[PDB]
Structures are given as C-alpha cells and as structure tokens.
Swiss-Prot record:
Disulfide bond annotation, renumbered to this chain: 6-17, 18-41, 32-75, 77-86, 89-98, 234-237, 266-279
Residues of this chain annotated as glycosylated in UniProt: 72, 80, 157, 280, 326, 361
Organism: Homo sapiens
EC number: 1.14.18.-
Subunit structure: Monomer. Interacts with ATP7A. Interacts with SLC45A2.
Gene name of the encoded protein: TYRP1
Binding site for Zn(2+) B: 353, 357, 380
Protein name in UniProt: 5,6-dihydroxyindole-2-carboxylic acid oxidase
Amino acid sequence: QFPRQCATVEALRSGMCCPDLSPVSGPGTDRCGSSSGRGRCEAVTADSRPHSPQYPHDGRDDREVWPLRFFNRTCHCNGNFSGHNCGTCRPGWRGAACDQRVLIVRRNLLDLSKEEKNHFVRALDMAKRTTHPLFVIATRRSEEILGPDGNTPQFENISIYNYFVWTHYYSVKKTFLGVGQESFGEVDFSHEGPAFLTWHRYHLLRLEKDMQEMLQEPSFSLPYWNFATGKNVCDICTDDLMGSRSNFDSTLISPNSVFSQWRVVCDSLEDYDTLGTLCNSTEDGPIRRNPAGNVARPMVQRLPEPQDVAQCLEVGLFDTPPFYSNSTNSFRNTVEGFSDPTGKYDPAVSSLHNLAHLFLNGTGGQVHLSPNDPIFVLLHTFTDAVFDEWLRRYNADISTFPLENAPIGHNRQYNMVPFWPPVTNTEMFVTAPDNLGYTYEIQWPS
Ligand SMILES: *[C@@H]1O[C@H](CO[C@@H]2O[C@@H](C)[C@@H](O)[C@@H](O)[C@@H]2O)[C@@H](O[C@@H]2O[C@H](CO)[C@@H](O)[C@H](O)[C@H]2NC(C)=O)[C@H](O)[C@H]1NC(C)=O
Ligand SMILES: *[C@@H]1O[C@H](CO)[C@@H](O[C@@H]2O[C@H](CO)[C@@H](O)[C@H](O)[C@H]2NC(C)=O)[C@H](O)[C@H]1NC(C)=O
Ligand SMILES: *[C@@H]1O[C@H](CO)[C@@H](O[C@@H]2O[C@H](CO)[C@@H](O)[C@H](O)[C@H]2NC(C)=O)[C@H](O)[C@H]1NC(C)=O
Ligand SMILES: *[C@@H]1O[C@H](CO)[C@@H](O)[C@H](O)[C@H]1NC(C)=O
Ligand SMILES: NC(=S)Nc1ccccc1
Ligand SMILES: [Zn+2]
Ligand SMILES: [Zn+2]
Ligand SMILES: [Zn+2]
C-alpha cells in the first residue's frame, strides 16, 4: 500500500512517508518536491469521529484511523501537483507544471472498434504481468512488519493489476484477533456503507492512472460493461473480450482468451484468518466463472433490467440511517444492491451491483476474490457511471453522507483504506468531468 521508498526500516521507524522527488544536495533535501514549489511534508489529517457500535475492537486493527498506525507524516502537494512525492499531477491535469487540462472518455466496451477492444485486452494482460513501479504490499500486519530479525521489511513487489486486487482484499479482510481466536467479520471498509461508491471510484482511478503510465498513453481510459440489460448471458464473455466459457470445463474461461492464463491472488483465507498473515503476491488457481450458473439461487440467474437503473436514479438522498446494508431509500444502498431499485429493503433482495456480481457465479462473485476476474473493472466503471449521473442530477449533495456513526471506515472524512497518499471520501464526491478529468459516453433509459 506504500511507496517502495517508504517500505524501509528507516521510514517505518520514523513514522514519516515523505520521499524525495529529485534531491540535488543529498538524501532528504527534496522531500515532497519542496525544493521546487511542488509540496511539503506535513502531519497526516485522519478522521477521529466515532463509528457505529458494530465494530467493538478499537485498538486491534491496522486499518483503524488510516493511516496513523504506519505513518503520521505525508506529502501534501501544492496546487494541482499530486502523488506520493508530488512528482505528478491531480486527475485531469498534465505537464511539468500540471497546467494542461485533459479529459478522457470512458466508453461502452461493446462500442469500441476491433482494434480498441484488442488494445484494451492486452493492456489488462500487460498490467497483470508488469511489476508496479511504485507500490509494494505488506505480507504481515504491523507488529510483524519488520520481519523475524526486526530488520527485514515484510513487503513484496506485486503487479499493477494484482495491487488492484490486493487493496480491495485488504479493505474487506476480517479483523484478526489472535491464533486460536475467531476473526471478526462484521467490518468492511469499502462495502455496506456510504463509502462504497467513493472507494470504488478511487480504486478505478488508481488503476486507470497506473495503466496510462504503463502504456505511456495519457488518454487510455477504462471502458464499462452495461450489465443492466435483463439478459440471461454475459454479453462481454466473448474471446475478443474477457473470454467465453471453456468447452472443456463450463466453470473455466475459454483457452482462446488470455484471461484463461490468469492466476488469482488472495485465495488463502484459511491461512490469513488463522495464522494472522496477509495476502501476498504469489498466485494460485485460475479464474472461475459460470454466468447464470447458480442453479441453487434462481434470483441471481439473470442480470438487472434497464428499468432498475432508471428507478435507482430516482432515489434523491445519497444514504440514510443506519448507513448500512439495511438502509431504506438510500441511493448508495440501492445501487450497491441490498435494496430493490425503488429503495425498499428486503434481506432476500439482490439487485444491480450485487446482482451483477452474483450473476457471475464464481471468482468475480466472491467477496474476497472478485477483482481477480477482470470483469470487475467493467462492472465498476458502470456502477461509477450511475454514481456520476446521480452526482450531476442531485448537484453532488453530500449532506446525507454521514460525518460520524457510519460503519467503521465509512465516515465522510475517513481516509479510504488502504489508499496512498491519504484520500478522503469527500475528494471523490465530485462530478467527474469538471473535477476528475474523465466522463462517461453513455445514455440513460427514459
Ligand atoms: C509519529 O511517529 C513516530 C514514529 O513512531 C511510529 O509511528 C507509528 C507507525 C506507530 O506504529 C509507532 O509504534 C511507531 O514507532 C513517533 O515517535 C515514536 O513514538 C513511540 C511511541 O509512540 C516511541 O516509543 C518512540 O521512541 C518514538 N520514536 C521517534 C523516533 O520519535 C511519534 O511520537 C509520532 N508523533 C505523533 C503520533 O504525534
Ligand atoms: C504467501 O501465501 C501463501 C498462501 O497462504 C503461503 O503458502 C501457504 O503457507 C502455509 C503456511 O506456511 C501452508 O500451510 C500452505 O499449504 C501454503 N499454501 C500454498 C498454496 O502454498 C506462502 O507461504 C506465503 N508466502 C510468504 C512468503 O509468506
Ligand atoms: C455457483 O453456483 C452453484 C449453484 O449452481 C453453487 O453451488 C451450490 O452451493 C450451495 C451452497 O454452498 C450448495 O448447497 C449446493 O449444493 C451447490 N450446488 C452445486 C451444484 O454445486 C456454488 O457455490 C456457486 N459458486 C460461487 C462461487 O458463486
Ligand atoms: C522489487 O523489485 C525490485 C526491482 O524493482 C527489486 O530490487 C526487489 O527484489 C523488490 N523489492 C522489494 C522491496 O521487494
Ligand atoms: N458476492 C459479492 S462479490 N458481493 C456481494 C456481497 C453481498 C451481497 C451480494 C453480493
Ligand atoms: Zn498542507
Ligand atoms: Zn468491491
Ligand atoms: Zn463490486
């Protein structure tokens, strides 16, 4: 989760993650690009408001009051500079002075040309294989972060796409209470709460940015999958996109797609939740996918209908008490899928986003693995498109996004876990075309 220059013995002991940009008087002389006007090292702002009583384990989990259990000093970048050491630009800006505006367009995957489809599939496959140039992931919790001898930081390199999988896993993992004890599972820093939409928004933004530099294509953008067609089948599960069903194993991906070659990370819950370790960069089995195949559960055998999307966009309040998976008339809870498209809660309901996940009946529909299936990317750009249309329609009204008593991780000023540098839900609660440098080529049913 941290820049590789902060994943050292020195940086962790200091509590400071303020790396140099280009120092030309020695180390520590250009922290946060302070010798240019680009930024400065300063104290971390973290949320201290109370959370819901559902989490009773304050003091036990490194994700609490993120990121204070690892660092209390961060770079704050000046103006429209951005990045861990202020060496890049805020979303929507480019240039050495971050003063040239950019606006990329996220399009329906099915509307792209034959060349554009092939370029997207190989970019994803490239990101699955290419080491992340900036971030390394911890394989142990903080008390064991410096290794057995106390001088070996327990971080591993990880590919650009597996880092995308890993941050999601880390945001949903159970609180480890100790060997012999049962891990606590009624906690989720990115789902079942107001932060669901802003968390996944930043999640996509980080991956899109990483792939832009990996490809050195500033205009590269992530497409979306319109899953609200009411269809019986996954219309993007073809061998020119995301892969069709294997004729030799109906739960595997066609060998004529590169995605049949992918191997998943974070599939050892037995180990993590009993020995206290974290998901590491070692890959395991293949992606399992079986669209419409959950015969035991007929309600998740068909995708949402077009009118489901139109109805959830009529929900005018972003979220409602108790800001959880049982909220009624909450746009966030409706599009997440715990309530029906009108906002009516029913514990037996699976709609929209949750239904699209369960429709896959496989890796993409399992809470600890879902980003391993690259359909996750397209499922959530569409979910983000619905969010962006809501932001336009209701003038980005953040007033119902609670400042306190949300599920832990979901207060408005919580730093979304485990993103670095620290970024709050508020910073994502903005209309994308004017504030984040992207827009959706899409039209809404009516
Ligand atoms: C800011 O952080 C430093 C470094 O402490 C680390 O910060 C966290 C990652 C946490 O996990 C601590 O255990 C780390 O040691 C703080 O300075 C240290 O504070 C500890 C106890 O809090 C003390 O035993 C050490 O001697 C201190 N070492 C140094 C070099 O200062 C510092 O207090 C923090 N400042 C705050 C929180 O305002
Ligand atoms: C990375 O994670 C894997 C999965 O947890 C670790 O492999 C497991 O290790 C446990 C205990 O050492 C064994 O009992 C399991 O049989 C292993 N599973 C597999 C699939 O190998 C692996 O050791 C971890 N790597 C590091 C460096 O910690
Ligand atoms: C995919 O769907 C199948 C159902 O078609 C699930 O398998 C069933 O799981 C339930 C609950 O564990 C069992 O009671 C049934 O006996 C299973 N049926 C069969 C035919 O296996 C499976 O769990 C789903 N997998 C995922 C990842 O969603
Ligand atoms: C990550 O890869 C780098 C090369 O970029 C290599 O020096 C080292 O093995 C890895 N570093 C860490 C901290 O794991
Ligand atoms: N299964 C996945 S990936 N998400 C989810 C979570 C809760 C309820 C329905 C779906
Ligand atoms: Zn500042
Ligand atoms: Zn998610
Ligand atoms: Zn999801």
